[PDB]
Amino acid sequence: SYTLTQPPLVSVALGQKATITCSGDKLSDVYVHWYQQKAGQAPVLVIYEDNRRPSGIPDHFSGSNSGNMATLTISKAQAGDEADYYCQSWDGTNSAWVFGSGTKVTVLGQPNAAPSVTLFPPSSEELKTNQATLVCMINGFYPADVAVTWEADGTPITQGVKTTQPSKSDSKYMATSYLTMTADAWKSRNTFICKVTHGGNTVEKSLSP
Amino acid sequence: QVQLKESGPGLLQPSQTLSLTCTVSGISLSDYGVHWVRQAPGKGLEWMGIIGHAGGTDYNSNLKSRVSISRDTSKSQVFLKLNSLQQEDTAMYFCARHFYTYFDVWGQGIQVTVSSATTTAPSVYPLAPACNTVTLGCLVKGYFPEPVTVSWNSGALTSGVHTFPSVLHSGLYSLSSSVTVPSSTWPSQTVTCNVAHPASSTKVDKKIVPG
């Protein structure tokens, strides 16, 4: 049951060194390989056998494998280098190929912008169905990673929640979070809140029936 | 020259058995093995198995007892089968060449969804603000399958629009759209949104109004 540990995210301003690290038991015994993957596309072999390039790949990728850490270097990062990156290896113990947990390398190319939140109440038209859907819409933020929390009368609300993944609009990212529930379990409560976290900033919007 | 393509269905239910053919060209299967790998939405790449150049096979432990790989070397076809399906089998499926330890050439990928959902037309609901420019919205709730077109005043509202990605729970999809309008225009001029769902043959207009 071999598993390769990989840090999930790696921010880096354009033209800086990005380092992604892959861990294992005796990772230097076996060869490591790295694949780049851009949203909705097949992986591409960027590095193989620890520190080797296939033809066609840029010279600004560079790998190494010592101790128990494999590492993929991106020197002088660019907009087109941003992607999900995956390390990989073989293991004899049980004949199988094992993939790393993946490192989403984000290449920052503009100021980090705060989100604009809008929290909509349920519609009369929906409430006649005896249902209630709150819509917390998040706009104009960068980079593309937010964290949403819901809270009713000051007690964290998890169940019934679902959030879209981020998605690029014009120049910045956008996302929504929904809270689904019964029509009267909305009318009962005093106040609802969606908390949208981004960077080291929280933005809050209230909604009280 | 050396290319791999995936073919097969993109919509199954938790009963059926999946069947994907990976078609090779440029090279011969007689002297190359082919891997299969999948990837659940926003999750890691998982190796499922391999069928070598010799015809020997080798599968993953967590997949085993319900996964089969075979081929047809004349047509250069490589086959994959997953019986006993569920929601969490839904993923992008890739086929990739074996070359020593690494995977040098990959397919483009084929999305597959496992879902017992039937073609349901959405419920469109308006979204007026709850008490220098205003933003309104349309909630397309509970539909299947994708996609769903969302417009505003039949294309007359191009600027200020924002269509967000669809989200899914208990089978059906949900999706919302919005329009920032100059504060003066609304509500002196009306704003309707136009939702289309070609799968359910449904076109539904909905005026957004103060409450």
Short description:
The complex is a heterodimer of chains A (209) and B (211). Helix content of chain A is 4%, strand content 52%.
Q: Strand pairing plus helix content of chain A: what structural class? A: mainly beta
The CATH topology name of the largest domain in chain A reads Immunoglobulin-like
State the helix count of chain B.
Answer: 1
Strand content of chain B: over 45%
PDB class: immune system
Keywords: antibody, HAMSTER IgG, immune system
Assembly: dimeric
Entry title: Crystal structure of HL4E10 Fab, a hamster Ab stimulatory for gammadelta T cells
Give the helices and strands, then pairings.
The complex is a heterodimer of chains A (209) and B (211).
Chain A: E1 9-13, E2 18-23, E3 32-37, E4 44-47, E5 61-66, E6 69-74, E7 83-91, E8 96-99, E9 103-108, E10 116-120, H1 124-127, E11 131-141, E12 147-152, E13 155-157, E14 161-163, E15 167-169, E16 172-182, H2 184-187, E17 192-198, E18 201-207
Parallel strand pairs in A: 1-9
Antiparallel strand pairs in A: 2-6, 3-4, 3-7, 5-6, 7-8, 7-9, 10-11, 11-16, 12-13, 12-17, 14-16, 15-16, 17-18
Chain B: E1 3-7, E2 11-12, E3 18-25, E4 34-39, E5 45-51, E6 57-59, E7 67-72, E8 77-82, E9 91-97, E10 110-114, E11 123-127, E12 133-143, E13 149-152, E14 161-163, E15 167-169, E16 172-182, H1 185-188, E17 191-197, E18 202-208
Parallel strand pairs in B: 2-10
Antiparallel strand pairs in B: 1-3, 3-8, 4-5, 4-9, 5-6, 7-8, 9-10, 11-12, 12-16, 13-17, 14-16, 15-16, 17-18
Describe this protein's structure.
It is classed as immune system. The complex is a heterodimer of chains A (209) and B (211). Chain A has helices at residues 124-127, 184-187, and strands at residues 9-13, 18-23, 32-37, 44-47, 61-66, 69-74, 83-91, 96-99, 103-108, 116-120, 131-141, 147-152, 155-157, 161-163, 167-169, 172-182, 192-198, 201-207. Chain A is mainly β. Chain A folds into 2 domains: 1-109, Immunoglobulins (Immunoglobulin-like); 110-209, Immunoglobulin-like (Sandwich), CATH 2.60.40. In chain A, strand 3 (32-37) and strand 4 form a beta hairpin. The longest helix of chain A has 4 residues, at 124-127. Chain A starts with 8 loop residues before the first strand and ends with a strand. In chain A, 37% of the residues are buried. Chain B is an all-beta fold. Chain B has 2 domains: 1-116, Immunoglobulin-like; 117-211, Sandwich (Immunoglobulin-like), CATH 2.60.40.10. Chain B contains 1 helix and 18 strands. At the A-B interface, strand 3, strand 7, strand 8, strand 10 and helix 1 of A face strand 5, strand 11, strand 12, strand 15 and strand 16 of B.
